Point group: C4
Chain length 31, copies 4
Amino acid sequence: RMKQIEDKLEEILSXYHIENELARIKKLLGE
Amino acid sequence: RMKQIEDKLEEILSXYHIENELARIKKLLGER
Amino acid sequence: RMKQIEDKLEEILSXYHIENELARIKKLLGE
Amino acid sequence: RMKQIEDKLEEILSXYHIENELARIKKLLGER
């Protein structure tokens, strides 16, 4: 069950995309 | 406790919608 | 230590704001 | 396992930056 949990944490980790998307949006907005 | 944990994680996972909404905004603002 | 963990999960929960902000941005963008 | 867990959670928490970046975008796009 600890494993299920850690599996859910890796699914949550699969956030950096969101960060990347945001950086890209700011730039498309003219910074 | 551990079922509160698994449930809080399912509540958090239930984020990809956010990523996809951002993918849309980025697409909308992209070069015409 | 289970408590520490559940505390971190409530901190993560404190995401709906992000959703709200996004809905507001789409609307400000002219939908 | 449990330290991998606590560490993955600290890696996730390390989100508020995202909220605040969105608060900025919303502020920028707000009525002049």
